[PDB]
Amino acid sequence: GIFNTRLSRTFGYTIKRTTVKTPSWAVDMMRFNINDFLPPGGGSNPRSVPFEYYRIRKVKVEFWPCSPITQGDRGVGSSAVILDDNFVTKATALTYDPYVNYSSRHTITQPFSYHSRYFTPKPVLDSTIDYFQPNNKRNQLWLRLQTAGNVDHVGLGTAFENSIYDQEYNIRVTMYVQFREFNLKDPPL
Amino acid sequence: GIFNTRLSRTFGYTIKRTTVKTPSWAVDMMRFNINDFLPPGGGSNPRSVPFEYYRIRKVKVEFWPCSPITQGDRGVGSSAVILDDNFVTKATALTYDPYVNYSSRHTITQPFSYHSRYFTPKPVLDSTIDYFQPNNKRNQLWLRLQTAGNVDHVGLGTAFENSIYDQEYNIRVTMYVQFREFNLKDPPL
Amino acid sequence: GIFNTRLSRTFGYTIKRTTVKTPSWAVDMMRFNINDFLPPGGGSNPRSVPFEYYRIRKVKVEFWPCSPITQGDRGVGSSAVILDDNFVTKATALTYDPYVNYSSRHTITQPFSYHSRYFTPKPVLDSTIDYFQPNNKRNQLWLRLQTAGNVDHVGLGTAFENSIYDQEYNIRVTMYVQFREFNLKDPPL
Amino acid sequence: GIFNTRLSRTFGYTIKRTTVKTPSWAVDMMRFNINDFLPPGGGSNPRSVPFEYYRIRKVKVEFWPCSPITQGDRGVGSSAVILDDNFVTKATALTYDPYVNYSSRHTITQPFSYHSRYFTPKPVLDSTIDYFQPNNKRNQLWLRLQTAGNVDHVGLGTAFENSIYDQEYNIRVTMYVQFREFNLKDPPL
Amino acid sequence: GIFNTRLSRTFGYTIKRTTVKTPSWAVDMMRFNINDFLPPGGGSNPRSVPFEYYRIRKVKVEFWPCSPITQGDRGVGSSAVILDDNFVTKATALTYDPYVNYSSRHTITQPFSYHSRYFTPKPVLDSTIDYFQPNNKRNQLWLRLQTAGNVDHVGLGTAFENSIYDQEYNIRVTMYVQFREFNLKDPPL
Amino acid sequence: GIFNTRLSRTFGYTIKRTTVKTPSWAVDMMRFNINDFLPPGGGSNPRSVPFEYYRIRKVKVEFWPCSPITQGDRGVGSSAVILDDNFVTKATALTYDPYVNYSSRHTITQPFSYHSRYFTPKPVLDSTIDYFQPNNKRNQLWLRLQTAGNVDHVGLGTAFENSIYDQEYNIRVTMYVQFREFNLKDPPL
Ligand SMILES: O=C(O)[C@@H]1O[C@@H](O[C@H]2[C@H](O)[C@@H](NS(=O)(=O)O)[C@@H](O[C@H]3[C@H](O)[C@@H](OS(=O)(=O)O)[C@H](O[C@H]4[C@H](O)[C@@H](NS(=O)(=O)O)[C@@H](O)O[C@@H]4COS(=O)(=O)O)O[C@H]3C(=O)O)O[C@@H]2COS(=O)(=O)O)[C@H](OS(=O)(=O)O)[C@@H](O)[C@@H]1O
């Protein structure tokens, strides 16, 4: 019983100002979990979408700027796809862009420019070995939609060039999911 | 955002015994409401299936017998489709089968025989005028999935021939519904 | 060195009687392990079928009744396919059939009727995440035929309607397996 | 339930040295039994390959030398196929090669040369009459895989020319067999 | 960013002499890890090949002999492919060749003969269950190129026939690997 | 062993204000060396990218503005390709644009506008004679990847109109190179 749908979530991210003169970059990570998109249900149905299995097909991360088009001290960054839960260490002012030479690098124009990334994440099945599957719609694993313990999906790391002014963003993540085995429970009343 | 699914519900019906010698029939009615198939949800989602609109496409009423194949004093009844909320009055021992000459009559062999009816019900929009639409999948009205006040659908009346022995049935109603406008609400936690 | 064969096993299951008047259902689970079908071998060959690897292709669960065709208080249940080791909790008299709205539900006529289910199980690789593969004969994983520690395969849950009389069954599970790498060891004597 | 497989076995054979000056030959025989290739099983399965019937299709006898390529006093012998259990009498130093004029003679170069023979043996059904079947894959008799009393198959006799030095060989016999009627027994535990 | 290349490594293996008269075999195992082929890098690049992911496509194990062609007491062994990290126990003088009846057995002529094996190994993801994938270039898992903790690949076991003389070999393993996501880091200086 | 790839780097360039009233321009050159893009390796491998050879195909210079779009006192400049390491003399405020009439001139809008150039640089073999090859992908030379002594490549010089305000740019370079002769070294540990 397949049901492809779309789930979204919005949150903020700010790159604080720095008095540093050099071009330094701010590094951070981004994971994706389905608990943040799918709330708990009620009653005999533990989740709000009554299905048993799921598998995330795609994610769309949108960096919607919060800064005016008149803001100066512009910069240039990079967003890369990291499917293994080993990101570059979080840094405030690093002397280089680590994600620049990555094959999945897209340039981030800053601060007043929109940046989208559309890709297929991978689940963290074993963080010790960090193995994942290649892209195959027919062979992608089905995970279970747990009650409160779903596994973290992974796949984006960023590097933003710091500035004299604060750079704020409203980040909207949209997960395109595919469920299976409609499992609604209908007790009496 | 269409989602065709199937919702079921099971309950009992008994035709009590009678010392009456004549062939008399027991008349009863059967309505269908979605509150009995779809429970209330939890939180910002008032219902367990997160959709706004619905329209019932078909219903399958199954009379599953509870009586052995050795039971005697067998009989013959009738099930008809009544799409207007004006049934023959409920009777314990009526001297005739009212639903026998109906164009939608199917014979009910009793007591140990299975009887199915598969039809398209109609909602009770105005009980004073009792108007309904003909069968058209493209023009069928969309109703709202209310929180606790959904409208009764209608469409089956029965007439069972009484017997010296009690005739029990387990009735399983299955509604084939079609929802629209996925309306999940995801507050923070 | 492929060798497709068929292994069987027979055991009993009883649904005890209840004085409860309502229609209640008895819920139970069913797992499949190869130790119960393949005994230990002898000598340098740890198992009786001299192969290294295996993968279960299909299972046929047959509920052969033990009750006469004259037994009354008949009922109606459901059998569903549960490929993840999270079954509905075992219950003696539950007020509803949980497996009724499942997409893999087959109706169980009770008590004197035969019920078969033919499906492809999945192994329990990680019970925490509960991931499994879709059906693909070419990409199905090969497991190792361990000596005394094989992994449990999963895939059936049932719900039987209780009765005044005891409902007994002789359950015959047949696993259709596929082995690989003939590994017979022939020491002298 | 046919299963064609391959069973092997390795053992030694030595032609001891002789001070005799003349060219003399050492004669010996070679039978084939399935007990030497198939060990006893364990439990309710008396044999390690769980089948009832068998029939030997082919045998490959390989004389793998043990002697260096610098060894002198080389010689020339003969291997023939003897399907009736009446071999030339075993001799240490016979004044001629008895198997030389046989229609199934292959020359054995000695001592450091490989010799293979690939043929279809015959079972010893009656040693008094010594009757056997011609080669026909469709009409070949099925024998029973006994527990500890299988019948000897026959089909090779050799004649090695003696030498001043010892001539050792590692003989690897490979039987290509065909079983029938998978008969595994699975008691409880 | 794919880059198919070839990495090699050379090491020794000796089968010590034995006074035992019988034909006995020496059993040993062979695993493959990428730390032994890829050294650690320097600086911000933890490895010498600047890539993130890898997957081993093929391995070529070459037994280059160290013994002269005049060496006697020759023998015959077997090399088999074992993709699950459960080898036959290491033995000095075992009374039989365990890897002889394996479907992946290749004969090892000893001592002065070259033996190659070209196959696709499998990683040890779970040693408890020992599951692996079949051969599929498009669906083969990508592993991470760790810093100092890469996972062991597996796939060869051997059985050498012992001798009066020591049998030495220089074993050259060549792994054909496929990397992904060029991740060079270029800080200033 | 060919390997095409991409390397990049980022640095700043500013044009200090001038109280001069006339239209004056500021001149500066730009060289290209691989040591700035490719850090040193570690251990036996002197460089992080294990190859012997390289030859630059293309370079992509990117003038990313740091200024707002509201800035006044706009101007206009020029850039040109210079393949000999004999540029126009560096100047602060020159009364004309030297690089205007060059055939390889691309106009530069200032101060808030993007500017890019995509060309083939050339090496400096002999600064005295200043010779090179026409563009040819097949006949281009292969240079050696030295340890700390690689040669400077060349190919860009600029001219920026001065202003009352400071014009700051973030310059990103991108090189498209092509290596050869994979030269990895695997000592033991
Ligand atoms: O006759 C004249 O016009 C004289 O002009 C002035 O001499 C100045 C130079 O003009 C000035 N350079 S400017 O850019 O033209 O202003 C400055 O040169 C030094 C700078 O570090 C570099 O100059 S630049 O022109 O390349 O920018 C340059 O560094 C070179 C180095 O010279 C190279 N070796 S050499 O063989 O050429 O000597 C090589 O080592 O690479 C270096 C780095 O180059 S890179 O491009 O950065 O990679 O040369 C430097 C140098 O030679 O000193 O200084 C010159 C000397 O004057 S001062 O610095 O002592 O003041 C003078 O007048 S004024 O204009 O300064 O007032 C005067 O000598 C004449 O009028």
PDB file of N, CA and C in Angstrom, chain A residues 87-156:
ATOM      1  N   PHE A  87      31.317  14.322   9.226  1.00  0.00           N
ATOM      2  CA  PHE A  87      31.421  15.662   8.693  1.00  0.00           C
ATOM      3  C   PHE A  87      32.753  16.278   9.079  1.00  0.00           C
ATOM      4  N   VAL A  88      33.120  17.333   8.357  1.00  0.00           N
ATOM      5  CA  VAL A  88      34.194  18.193   8.818  1.00  0.00           C
ATOM      6  C   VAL A  88      33.777  18.782  10.151  1.00  0.00           C
ATOM      7  N   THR A  89      34.735  18.887  11.061  1.00  0.00           N
ATOM      8  CA  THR A  89      34.443  19.341  12.408  1.00  0.00           C
ATOM      9  C   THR A  89      33.840  20.737  12.380  1.00  0.00           C
ATOM     10  N   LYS A  90      32.860  20.956  13.248  1.00  0.00           N
ATOM     11  CA  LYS A  90      32.223  22.258  13.341  1.00  0.00           C
ATOM     12  C   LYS A  90      33.234  23.306  13.772  1.00  0.00           C
ATOM     13  N   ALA A  91      33.287  24.395  13.015  1.00  0.00           N
ATOM     14  CA  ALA A  91      34.251  25.456  13.218  1.00  0.00           C
ATOM     15  C   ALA A  91      33.557  26.799  13.096  1.00  0.00           C
ATOM     16  N   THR A  92      34.072  27.772  13.839  1.00  0.00           N
ATOM     17  CA  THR A  92      33.556  29.131  13.811  1.00  0.00           C
ATOM     18  C   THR A  92      34.245  29.968  12.744  1.00  0.00           C
ATOM     19  N   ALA A  93      35.577  29.954  12.722  1.00  0.00           N
ATOM     20  CA  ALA A  93      36.357  30.702  11.738  1.00  0.00           C
ATOM     21  C   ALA A  93      37.523  29.825  11.303  1.00  0.00           C
ATOM     22  N   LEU A  94      37.292  29.022  10.277  1.00  0.00           N
ATOM     23  CA  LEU A  94      38.318  28.191   9.675  1.00  0.00           C
ATOM     24  C   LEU A  94      38.932  28.913   8.485  1.00  0.00           C
ATOM     25  N   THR A  95      40.236  28.747   8.314  1.00  0.00           N
ATOM     26  CA  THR A  95      41.009  29.509   7.344  1.00  0.00           C
ATOM     27  C   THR A  95      40.818  29.054   5.906  1.00  0.00           C
ATOM     28  N   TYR A  96      39.887  28.151   5.634  1.00  0.00           N
ATOM     29  CA  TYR A  96      39.672  27.666   4.282  1.00  0.00           C
ATOM     30  C   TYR A  96      38.285  27.054   4.208  1.00  0.00           C
ATOM     31  N   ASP A  97      37.836  26.822   2.983  1.00  0.00           N
ATOM     32  CA  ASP A  97      36.563  26.175   2.713  1.00  0.00           C
ATOM     33  C   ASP A  97      36.811  24.688   2.515  1.00  0.00           C
ATOM     34  N   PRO A  98      36.459  23.823   3.468  1.00  0.00           N
ATOM     35  CA  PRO A  98      36.787  22.411   3.290  1.00  0.00           C
ATOM     36  C   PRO A  98      35.975  21.734   2.210  1.00  0.00           C
ATOM     37  N   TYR A  99      34.742  22.169   1.999  1.00  0.00           N
ATOM     38  CA  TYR A  99      33.835  21.530   1.071  1.00  0.00           C
ATOM     39  C   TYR A  99      33.972  22.060  -0.348  1.00  0.00           C
ATOM     40  N   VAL A 100      35.065  22.749  -0.660  1.00  0.00           N
ATOM     41  CA  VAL A 100      35.180  23.425  -1.943  1.00  0.00           C
ATOM     42  C   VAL A 100      35.571  22.448  -3.039  1.00  0.00           C
ATOM     43  N   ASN A 101      36.471  21.521  -2.746  1.00  0.00           N
ATOM     44  CA  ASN A 101      36.950  20.574  -3.732  1.00  0.00           C
ATOM     45  C   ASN A 101      36.120  19.306  -3.784  1.00  0.00           C
ATOM     46  N   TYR A 102      35.030  19.243  -3.033  1.00  0.00           N
ATOM     47  CA  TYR A 102      34.155  18.088  -3.077  1.00  0.00           C
ATOM     48  C   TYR A 102      33.431  18.008  -4.405  1.00  0.00           C
ATOM     49  N   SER A 103      33.252  16.783  -4.885  1.00  0.00           N
ATOM     50  CA  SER A 103      32.571  16.553  -6.144  1.00  0.00           C
ATOM     51  C   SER A 103      31.117  16.986  -6.110  1.00  0.00           C
ATOM     52  N   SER A 104      30.515  17.060  -4.925  1.00  0.00           N
ATOM     53  CA  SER A 104      29.136  17.480  -4.754  1.00  0.00           C
ATOM     54  C   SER A 104      29.020  18.912  -4.266  1.00  0.00           C
ATOM     55  N   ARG A 105      30.032  19.730  -4.506  1.00  0.00           N
ATOM     56  CA  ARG A 105      30.011  21.104  -4.052  1.00  0.00           C
ATOM     57  C   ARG A 105      29.159  21.945  -4.981  1.00  0.00           C
ATOM     58  N   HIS A 106      28.271  22.727  -4.383  1.00  0.00           N
ATOM     59  CA  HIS A 106      27.573  23.807  -5.045  1.00  0.00           C
ATOM     60  C   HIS A 106      27.964  25.088  -4.337  1.00  0.00           C
ATOM     61  N   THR A 107      28.192  26.133  -5.111  1.00  0.00           N
ATOM     62  CA  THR A 107      28.572  27.415  -4.554  1.00  0.00           C
ATOM     63  C   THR A 107      27.392  28.075  -3.863  1.00  0.00           C
ATOM     64  N   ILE A 108      27.656  28.619  -2.684  1.00  0.00           N
ATOM     65  CA  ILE A 108      26.694  29.412  -1.934  1.00  0.00           C
ATOM     66  C   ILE A 108      27.130  30.858  -2.092  1.00  0.00           C
ATOM     67  N   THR A 109      26.350  31.620  -2.839  1.00  0.00           N
ATOM     68  CA  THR A 109      26.459  33.064  -2.801  1.00  0.00           C
ATOM     69  C   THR A 109      25.776  33.579  -1.545  1.00  0.00           C
ATOM     70  N   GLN A 110      26.431  34.506  -0.869  1.00  0.00           N
ATOM     71  CA  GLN A 110      25.991  35.042   0.403  1.00  0.00           C
ATOM     72  C   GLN A 110      25.863  36.553   0.298  1.00  0.00           C
ATOM     73  N   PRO A 111      25.064  37.183   1.168  1.00  0.00           N
ATOM     74  CA  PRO A 111      24.137  36.682   2.180  1.00  0.00           C
ATOM     75  C   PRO A 111      22.684  36.619   1.752  1.00  0.00           C
ATOM     76  N   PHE A 112      22.354  37.289   0.652  1.00  0.00           N
ATOM     77  CA  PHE A 112      20.974  37.545   0.265  1.00  0.00           C
ATOM     78  C   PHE A 112      20.525  36.692  -0.905  1.00  0.00           C
ATOM     79  N   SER A 113      21.095  35.507  -1.054  1.00  0.00           N
ATOM     80  CA  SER A 113      20.846  34.660  -2.202  1.00  0.00           C
ATOM     81  C   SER A 113      20.320  33.311  -1.753  1.00  0.00           C
ATOM     82  N   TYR A 114      19.423  32.768  -2.555  1.00  0.00           N
ATOM     83  CA  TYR A 114      18.775  31.500  -2.291  1.00  0.00           C
ATOM     84  C   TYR A 114      19.646  30.349  -2.761  1.00  0.00           C
ATOM     85  N   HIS A 115      19.673  29.292  -1.962  1.00  0.00           N
ATOM     86  CA  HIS A 115      20.465  28.104  -2.229  1.00  0.00           C
ATOM     87  C   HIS A 115      19.604  26.885  -1.966  1.00  0.00           C
ATOM     88  N   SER A 116      19.456  26.041  -2.979  1.00  0.00           N
ATOM     89  CA  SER A 116      18.732  24.789  -2.876  1.00  0.00           C
ATOM     90  C   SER A 116      19.666  23.626  -3.149  1.00  0.00           C
ATOM     91  N   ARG A 117      19.381  22.504  -2.498  1.00  0.00           N
ATOM     92  CA  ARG A 117      20.079  21.248  -2.733  1.00  0.00           C
ATOM     93  C   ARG A 117      19.040  20.144  -2.715  1.00  0.00           C
ATOM     94  N   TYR A 118      19.019  19.341  -3.768  1.00  0.00           N
ATOM     95  CA  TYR A 118      18.050  18.269  -3.957  1.00  0.00           C
ATOM     96  C   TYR A 118      18.813  16.982  -4.191  1.00  0.00           C
ATOM     97  N   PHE A 119      18.677  16.045  -3.265  1.00  0.00           N
ATOM     98  CA  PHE A 119      19.494  14.847  -3.272  1.00  0.00           C
ATOM     99  C   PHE A 119      18.760  13.740  -2.537  1.00  0.00           C
ATOM    100  N   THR A 120      19.360  12.560  -2.564  1.00  0.00           N
ATOM    101  CA  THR A 120      18.826  11.362  -1.941  1.00  0.00           C
ATOM    102  C   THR A 120      19.648  11.019  -0.710  1.00  0.00           C
ATOM    103  N   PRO A 121      19.119  11.147   0.503  1.00  0.00           N
ATOM    104  CA  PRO A 121      19.929  10.841   1.677  1.00  0.00           C
ATOM    105  C   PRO A 121      20.085   9.355   1.897  1.00  0.00           C
ATOM    106  N   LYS A 122      20.836   8.995   2.928  1.00  0.00           N
ATOM    107  CA  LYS A 122      21.094   7.615   3.275  1.00  0.00           C
ATOM    108  C   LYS A 122      20.968   7.469   4.783  1.00  0.00           C
ATOM    109  N   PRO A 123      20.454   6.345   5.271  1.00  0.00           N
ATOM    110  CA  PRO A 123      20.338   6.166   6.712  1.00  0.00           C
ATOM    111  C   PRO A 123      21.620   5.673   7.356  1.00  0.00           C
ATOM    112  N   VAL A 124      21.712   5.948   8.652  1.00  0.00           N
ATOM    113  CA  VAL A 124      22.868   5.572   9.457  1.00  0.00           C
ATOM    114  C   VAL A 124      22.545   4.210  10.058  1.00  0.00           C
ATOM    115  N   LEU A 125      22.895   3.163   9.318  1.00  0.00           N
ATOM    116  CA  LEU A 125      22.665   1.800   9.766  1.00  0.00           C
ATOM    117  C   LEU A 125      23.750   1.337  10.723  1.00  0.00           C
ATOM    118  N   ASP A 126      25.009   1.616  10.399  1.00  0.00           N
ATOM    119  CA  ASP A 126      26.131   1.312  11.281  1.00  0.00           C
ATOM    120  C   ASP A 126      27.099   2.478  11.202  1.00  0.00           C
ATOM    121  N   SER A 127      27.179   3.255  12.279  1.00  0.00           N
ATOM    122  CA  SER A 127      28.085   4.389  12.324  1.00  0.00           C
ATOM    123  C   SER A 127      29.542   3.974  12.431  1.00  0.00           C
ATOM    124  N   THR A 128      29.816   2.731  12.823  1.00  0.00           N
ATOM    125  CA  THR A 128      31.186   2.254  12.927  1.00  0.00           C
ATOM    126  C   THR A 128      31.787   1.978  11.558  1.00  0.00           C
ATOM    127  N   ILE A 129      30.998   1.406  10.655  1.00  0.00           N
ATOM    128  CA  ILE A 129      31.458   1.007   9.333  1.00  0.00           C
ATOM    129  C   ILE A 129      31.036   2.049   8.311  1.00  0.00           C
ATOM    130  N   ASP A 130      29.864   2.641   8.523  1.00  0.00           N
ATOM    131  CA  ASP A 130      29.342   3.709   7.680  1.00  0.00           C
ATOM    132  C   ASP A 130      29.205   3.245   6.231  1.00  0.00           C
ATOM    133  N   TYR A 131      28.313   2.282   6.036  1.00  0.00           N
ATOM    134  CA  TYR A 131      28.000   1.749   4.719  1.00  0.00           C
ATOM    135  C   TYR A 131      26.645   2.256   4.257  1.00  0.00           C
ATOM    136  N   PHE A 132      26.518   2.451   2.949  1.00  0.00           N
ATOM    137  CA  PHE A 132      25.276   2.920   2.367  1.00  0.00           C
ATOM    138  C   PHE A 132      25.121   2.361   0.965  1.00  0.00           C
ATOM    139  N   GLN A 133      23.960   2.443   0.486  1.00  0.00           N
ATOM    140  CA  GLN A 133      23.564   1.927  -0.806  1.00  0.00           C
ATOM    141  C   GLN A 133      23.693   2.987  -1.887  1.00  0.00           C
ATOM    142  N   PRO A 134      23.982   2.605  -3.122  1.00  0.00           N
ATOM    143  CA  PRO A 134      23.849   3.564  -4.213  1.00  0.00           C
ATOM    144  C   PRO A 134      22.404   3.841  -4.559  1.00  0.00           C
ATOM    145  N   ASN A 135      22.187   4.800  -5.443  1.00  0.00           N
ATOM    146  CA  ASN A 135      20.843   5.236  -5.764  1.00  0.00           C
ATOM    147  C   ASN A 135      20.167   4.201  -6.651  1.00  0.00           C
ATOM    148  N   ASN A 136      19.093   3.616  -6.139  1.00  0.00           N
ATOM    149  CA  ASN A 136      18.299   2.655  -6.893  1.00  0.00           C
ATOM    150  C   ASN A 136      16.907   2.697  -6.295  1.00  0.00           C
ATOM    151  N   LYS A 137      15.937   3.163  -7.068  1.00  0.00           N
ATOM    152  CA  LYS A 137      14.598   3.283  -6.531  1.00  0.00           C
ATOM    153  C   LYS A 137      13.987   1.923  -6.235  1.00  0.00           C
ATOM    154  N   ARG A 138      14.382   0.894  -6.976  1.00  0.00           N
ATOM    155  CA  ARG A 138      13.767  -0.415  -6.833  1.00  0.00           C
ATOM    156  C   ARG A 138      14.366  -1.219  -5.693  1.00  0.00           C
ATOM    157  N   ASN A 139      15.615  -0.943  -5.330  1.00  0.00           N
ATOM    158  CA  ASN A 139      16.342  -1.710  -4.333  1.00  0.00           C
ATOM    159  C   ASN A 139      16.534  -0.969  -3.021  1.00  0.00           C
ATOM    160  N   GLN A 140      15.991   0.232  -2.882  1.00  0.00           N
ATOM    161  CA  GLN A 140      16.165   0.998  -1.662  1.00  0.00           C
ATOM    162  C   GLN A 140      15.484   0.305  -0.497  1.00  0.00           C
ATOM    163  N   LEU A 141      16.193   0.247   0.618  1.00  0.00           N
ATOM    164  CA  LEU A 141      15.703  -0.432   1.798  1.00  0.00           C
ATOM    165  C   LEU A 141      14.482   0.267   2.366  1.00  0.00           C
ATOM    166  N   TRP A 142      13.569  -0.538   2.891  1.00  0.00           N
ATOM    167  CA  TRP A 142      12.450  -0.055   3.678  1.00  0.00           C
ATOM    168  C   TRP A 142      12.838  -0.112   5.142  1.00  0.00           C
ATOM    169  N   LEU A 143      12.722   1.010   5.820  1.00  0.00           N
ATOM    170  CA  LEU A 143      12.873   1.084   7.258  1.00  0.00           C
ATOM    171  C   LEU A 143      11.505   1.038   7.908  1.00  0.00           C
ATOM    172  N   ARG A 144      11.509   0.790   9.209  1.00  0.00           N
ATOM    173  CA  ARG A 144      10.298   0.824  10.003  1.00  0.00           C
ATOM    174  C   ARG A 144      10.091   2.213  10.571  1.00  0.00           C
ATOM    175  N   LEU A 145       8.845   2.655  10.529  1.00  0.00           N
ATOM    176  CA  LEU A 145       8.426   3.893  11.162  1.00  0.00           C
ATOM    177  C   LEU A 145       8.229   3.609  12.641  1.00  0.00           C
ATOM    178  N   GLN A 146       9.287   3.834  13.408  1.00  0.00           N
ATOM    179  CA  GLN A 146       9.262   3.592  14.833  1.00  0.00           C
ATOM    180  C   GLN A 146       8.358   4.606  15.522  1.00  0.00           C
ATOM    181  N   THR A 147       8.152   4.388  16.816  1.00  0.00           N
ATOM    182  CA  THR A 147       7.293   5.267  17.595  1.00  0.00           C
ATOM    183  C   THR A 147       8.025   6.531  18.026  1.00  0.00           C
ATOM    184  N   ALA A 148       9.194   6.382  18.673  1.00  0.00           N
ATOM    185  CA  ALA A 148       9.971   7.537  19.107  1.00  0.00           C
ATOM    186  C   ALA A 148      11.477   7.349  18.954  1.00  0.00           C
ATOM    187  N   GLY A 149      11.921   6.493  18.041  1.00  0.00           N
ATOM    188  CA  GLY A 149      13.326   6.142  17.945  1.00  0.00           C
ATOM    189  C   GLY A 149      13.856   5.967  16.542  1.00  0.00           C
ATOM    190  N   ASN A 150      13.321   6.721  15.596  1.00  0.00           N
ATOM    191  CA  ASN A 150      13.721   6.572  14.210  1.00  0.00           C
ATOM    192  C   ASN A 150      15.181   6.958  14.005  1.00  0.00           C
ATOM    193  N   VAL A 151      15.750   6.432  12.938  1.00  0.00           N
ATOM    194  CA  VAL A 151      17.174   6.550  12.656  1.00  0.00           C
ATOM    195  C   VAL A 151      17.434   7.826  11.873  1.00  0.00           C
ATOM    196  N   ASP A 152      18.595   8.419  12.118  1.00  0.00           N
ATOM    197  CA  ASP A 152      18.946   9.685  11.502  1.00  0.00           C
ATOM    198  C   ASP A 152      19.434   9.459  10.084  1.00  0.00           C
ATOM    199  N   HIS A 153      18.860  10.196   9.151  1.00  0.00           N
ATOM    200  CA  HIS A 153      19.380  10.287   7.804  1.00  0.00           C
ATOM    201  C   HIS A 153      20.326  11.465   7.703  1.00  0.00           C
ATOM    202  N   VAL A 154      21.219  11.384   6.727  1.00  0.00           N
ATOM    203  CA  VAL A 154      22.378  12.254   6.660  1.00  0.00           C
ATOM    204  C   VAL A 154      22.620  12.606   5.200  1.00  0.00           C
ATOM    205  N   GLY A 155      23.422  13.648   4.972  1.00  0.00           N
ATOM    206  CA  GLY A 155      23.610  14.101   3.616  1.00  0.00           C
ATOM    207  C   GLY A 155      23.835  15.561   3.298  1.00  0.00           C
ATOM    208  N   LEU A 156      24.074  16.438   4.270  1.00  0.00           N
ATOM    209  CA  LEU A 156      24.475  17.791   3.900  1.00  0.00           C
ATOM    210  C   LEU A 156      25.415  18.421   4.908  1.00  0.00           C
TER     211      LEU A 156
END
